[PDB]
A paper describes a structure:
Earlier, we identified dextranase (FjDex31A) and kojibiose hydrolase (FjGH65A) in the dextran utilization locus (FjDexUL) of a soil Bacteroidota Flavobacterium johnsoniae and hypothesized that FjDexUL is involved in the degradation of α-(1→2)-branched dextran. FjDexUL consists of eight genes that encode proteins Fjoh_4428–Fjoh_4435: SusR homolog (Fjoh_4435, hereafter FjDusR), SusC homolog (Fjoh_4434, FjDusC), SusD homolog (Fjoh_4433, FjDusD), SusE/F homolog (Fjoh_4432, FjDusE), GH66 enzyme (Fjoh_4431, FjGH66), GH31 dextranase (Fjoh_4430, FjDex31A), GH97 enzyme (Fjoh_4429, FjGH97A), and GH65 kojibiose hydrolase (Fjoh_4428, FjGH65A). Collectively, FjDexUL proteins are suggested to be involved in the degradation of α-(1→2)- and α-(1→3)-branched dextrans.
The overall structures are almost identical (root mean squared deviation of 0.304 < Cα ≤ 0.472 Å); therefore, the following descriptions are based primarily on IG3-complex structure at 1.18 Å resolution. In the FjGH66 subsite −4, Phe256 and Gly253 were replaced by tryptophan and proline in TpDex, respectively, and Lys429 conformation was different from that of Lys450 of TpDex. The conformations of Lys429 are identical between the ligand-free and IG3 complex structures (not shown). The crystal structure of FjGH66 shows that some sugar-binding subsites can accommodate α-(1→2)- and α-(1→3)-branches. Enzymatic and structural analyses of FjGH66 revealed that FjGH66 accommodates α-(1→2)- or α-(1→3)-branches at all subsites except subsites −1 and −2.
Numbering used by the authors: 39 to 110, 113 to 586
Write the structure that this text describes.
Amino acid sequence: TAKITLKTDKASYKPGETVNFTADKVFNSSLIRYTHLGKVIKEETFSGTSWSWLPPSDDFQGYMVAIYQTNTTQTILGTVGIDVSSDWAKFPRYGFLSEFGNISESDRAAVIDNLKDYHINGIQFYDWQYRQHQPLAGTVSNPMPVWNDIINREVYGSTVSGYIAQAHSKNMKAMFYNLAYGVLNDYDPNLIKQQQFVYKDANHNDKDKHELGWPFISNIYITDPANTAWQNYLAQKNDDVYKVYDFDGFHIDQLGDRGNVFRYDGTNADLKNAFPSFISAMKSANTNKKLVMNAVNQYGQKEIAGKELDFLYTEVWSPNEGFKDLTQVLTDNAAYSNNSKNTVLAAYMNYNKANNQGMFNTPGVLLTDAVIFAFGGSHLELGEHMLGKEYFPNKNLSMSAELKSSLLEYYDFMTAYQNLLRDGGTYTNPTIATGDGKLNLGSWPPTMGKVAAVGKQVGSREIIHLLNFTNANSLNWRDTDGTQNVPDLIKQAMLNLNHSGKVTKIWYASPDYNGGAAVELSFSQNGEKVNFKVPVLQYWAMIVVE
């Protein structure tokens, strides 16, 4: 629907770094407007397809840039969000890579550039590694140029390093996947002793294992993350990696709750309580390297939320299948971290559908990211393709050109307005009411048939999110079979808001309307009672009262 595709050269920008813009088209009588939280901070003539802007230098600030044509009113031509951050961890927008074979440099560039346009600021390299117990193939002095992975696919070192370089060139961090504790059947028993493993019983008979059939090479066997011999072994493995591949850090994965399992000596392995010492030991060994750890279905989250992790990560499973279950994870993560850490959700959309070639269900994907983004979360979902399954190379489902377009606007939006979405504040219930019957308004958690209003006091602003369940035919976020409805647009819906405190300005932004650029609304205020009209509600509208 946008006339123009507006992009920048990098995914994000440290303070003092220049932003280089490309537009695909030029139009006459147009203006580039730079906004910070809805306020114009610069305008200039739209003059060509390529120009630059040096952003203000305050750290951790999101901006929107919007090109307008003047009609003999103004029409939005297209938008881009910009993130000024010194470091990804405050506002993580996490993506993946999953294929590391003989892939050309231009093919790799097209992958990274596309991730760059979603402002992805870090990438989890998934199944890059040789083995869980030896991520580096070969030696530091003599690294193997080609190896085979857990599915016996070829991985090229030069593809790994090439993607690390390309990610770096776009201001993205590179995080190497491995398990915290994983060992395959070709490990060296001289190095990883019996004493190190986790067992299904007290008599060190049977080792705990995640069973994998063909074409996987091995079951994943399981060590004690608290075991210091294990820790020192794996620190050496990590160091080797770092000396060969210039990863910024270690994305620590695990298999989630193993139920009731045991150490060599018969004591409860209680793995959630073993992770803290593991994380500390990994950080201690490579103090310059970042750590993120997957609390699978929250297993370990409370125990690890206080440790040296850049931000928190949760892979979401049953029984956390409701929209209200994703916000419970986000609320619990804030509480476990004492409001220190934001969260990334791994939450694989259209999961059952992804048993076969097909399309992602656009409305299910968008409704999901609306809830996630609106509540200050982030979704790990984009790499070479979008995730349909926990096995990231699975690319059975494609994104329509419409979904691609739309999701770019959703990433623009959660970037531009990060300062409002996930940079402090308190959730409140706004006292709001339809003025014209056009909205059937409720609170959070949501109700099918209703628009849910979510309030956040963020410094001196009042934020109101409208999240549209009017046409929802389920409240399960995964939309596993791709059945979720596209919501009908609601237009020009009058809202009544109690707000004591003089209102100065009210503004609207939605990723569904005008590329998420701020629109100032008309309003009246009669003592406490404030009215105004929202232009368009489809999935997700944000109202901001200053």
